[PDB]
């Protein structure tokens, strides 16, 4: 809690606005993503494995398509039924994500509570939109786009399902960010259904942000500490204690 | 309409091809030019609306107004930020393609005057500066280069070789390394 509190206080004091917060490749964002991975790989695979098994097995025979771009649309396919199938399966897995609040792990719940407190310490209004978006930009939608690469599925899905899951990441990111589609013209028919699920996502985000592992392995922190030893004493008795601990241990 | 977007892409081709110009002031102006493209792409709307070079163009804007010096450090920063872009814009794709097309004619007329060598090494630094992301014409350039640094019998001679062992020696994309290694292996 103190560790994440320190780096996230540094991240929110070094951030310019709320709209650019935790949306880059910073160290705090990488630690956010790794905390998501190590506290929710099991929860996310248990939430998404039967749903992807319903999508791949016993749904995908009858030329089901989610291609909603009229430029890339096949002449044998229909835009309206592609949008209908996409909105149906979107409503299903969005409802599953909202209903998965009780199965959410408590350690990552305390992590998101600390994140909520930190963002509320500088952005007291609508901090939860910064909280939920980070859970969708870095945790749920990368596993949605690449389920085989996330370890959720044993193999890669068919490419029509992959296009549907990339559009799933786009639609759910528009849901979680509380921002409608303004860039792509073919994404605009879903704006009403995204607006109808704004507060449904926000209630789950507020439920998560309110209110247990083994020991460390063989990791040699000596190599990380001593290949960068030259300028850590320069950056400002911690340096003296570090030098004594350096002298007490023989370098390999 | 898509026609103004098409003309905008042709403008991006023009800016990318002026990025290797011998005159330092033209490269400085073309580097400073990108803020207008960024703000117009912002007010037509986030980051996906522009082809994802927006943060690298911010870096272009930041380096554009720092310092004016000799051409060597300017070219070095040009190779740095042209390595750093890491995205396949179609304007960028056209930019390395037509410069590679003029590159063969350029090295042909050099093979069969020091300003010509200056713009020549500028073209090498520009083309090796780009990632040239394939995801093959880039391999054609690579085999040309591996056939080139021997440069066994030529009047200018070593001013090729040494410059080459700097330019591919220092200025090359990190994602371009396996192709170079695999070419060196079977040469």
């Amino acid at each position: 809690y103190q560790l994440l509190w320190n780096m996230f206080s540094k991240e929110v004091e070094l951030a310019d606005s709320m709209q650019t917060l935790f949306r880059g490749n910073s160290l705090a964002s990488k630690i956010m993503t790794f905390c998501f991975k190590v506290y929710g790989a099991t929860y996310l695979q248990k939430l998404l494995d039967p749903l992807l098994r319903i999508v791949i097995t016993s749904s995908d025979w009858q030329h089901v398509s989610f291609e909603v771009d009229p430029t890339r649309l096949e002449p044998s396919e229909s835009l309206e039924e592609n949008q209908r199938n996409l909105l149906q399966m979107t409503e299903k897995f969005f409802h599953a994500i909202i209903s998965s609040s009780s199965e959410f792990p408590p350690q990552l719940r305390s992590v998101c509570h600390c994140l909520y407190q930190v963002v509320s310490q500088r952005f007291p209004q609508n901090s939860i939109g910064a909280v939920g978006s980070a859970m969708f930009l870095r945790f749920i939608n990368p596993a949605i786009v690449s389920p085989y690469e996330a370890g959720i599925l044993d193999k890669k899905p068919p490419p029509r399902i992959e296009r549907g899951l990339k559009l799933m990441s786009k639609i759910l990111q528009s849901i979680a960010n509380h921002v409608l589609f303004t860039k792509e013209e073919h994404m605009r028919p879903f704006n009403d259904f995204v607006k109808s699920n704004f507060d449904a996502a926000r209630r789950f985000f507020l439920d998560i942000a309110s209110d247990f592992i083994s020991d460390g392995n063989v990791l040699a922190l000596h190599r990380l500490l001593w290949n960068n030893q030259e300028k850590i004493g320069q950056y400002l008795r911690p340096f003296d204690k570090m030098a004594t601990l350096l002298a007490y241990l023989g370098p390999p | 309409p898509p026609i103004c977007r098409q003309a905008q892409t042709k403008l991006e081709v023009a800016l990318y091809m002026f990025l290797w110009n011998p005159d330092t002031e033209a490269v400085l102006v073309a580097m400073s030019c990108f803020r207008h493209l960024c703000e117009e792409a912002d007010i037509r709307c986030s980051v996906h609306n522009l082809l994802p070079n927006y943060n690298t163009f911010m870096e272009f804007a930041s380096v554009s107004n720092m310092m004016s010096t000799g051409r060597a450090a300017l070219q070095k920063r040009v190779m740095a930020l042209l390595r750093r872009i890491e995205h396949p814009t179609a304007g960028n794709t056209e930019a390395w393609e037509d410069t590679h097309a003029k590159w063969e004619q350029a090295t042909k007329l050099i093979l069969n005057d020091t300003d010509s060598l200056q713009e020549w090494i500028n073209m090498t630094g520009f083309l090796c500066a780009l990632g040239g992301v394939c995801l093959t014409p880039v391999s054609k350039f690579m085999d040309r280069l591996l056939s080139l640094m021997v440069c066994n019998h030529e009047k200018v001679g070593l001013q090729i070789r040494t410059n080459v062992k700097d330019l591919v020696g220092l200025e090359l994309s990190p994602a371009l390394y396996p192709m170079l290694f695999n070419k060196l292996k079977n040469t």
Partner: protein, 144 residues
């Protein structure tokens, strides 16, 4: 050292019995190995002489003072009559590595020389800083 006050000279390398003190300080350096001088009863006298003659004289004696301090702490650690607790032995063990540092090489006046024991047994001076004596006395106070 008590009787040097009768005919005072400011340097203490200028006083008439400087060679006497240097010669008998070499005795303590030789004899300081394995509690061969009893640190369990002569410790406060011994630190007094240590404080009085840091960074004095030629390079060999300056390194000898440092080696004397190291051997004092080492024999203080390895002495069995004192029967210390574990935490005190731990802080002495850290203090040995503290005095081994190049910072204390600078404090004791041996900056150019890599190893004290090499120059100490082999056989123009930089000025003394009094705050260095303050730091050394604070370290010995903490140990004591």
């Amino acid at each position: 050292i008590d009787k040097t006050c009768l005919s005072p000279t400011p340097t203490l390398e200028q006083h008439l019995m400087w060679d006497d003190i240097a010669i008998l300080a070499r005795y303590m350096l030789m004899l300081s190995f394995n509690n061969s001088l009893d640190v369990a009863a002569h410790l406060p006298y011994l630190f007094h002489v240590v404080t009085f003659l840091v960074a004095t004289g030629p390079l060999s004696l300056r390194a000898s003072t440092h080696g004397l301090v190291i051997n004092i702490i080492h024999s203080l650690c390895t002495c069995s009559q004192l029967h210390f607790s574990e935490e005190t032995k731990q802080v002495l063990r850290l203090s040995l590595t503290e005095f081994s540092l190049p910072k204390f090489y600078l404090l004791f006046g041996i900056s150019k020389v890599k190893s004290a024991a090499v120059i100490a047994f082999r056989s123009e001076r930089e000025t003394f800083a009094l705050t260095s004596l303050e730091t050394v006395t604070e370290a010995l106070l903490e140990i004591m």
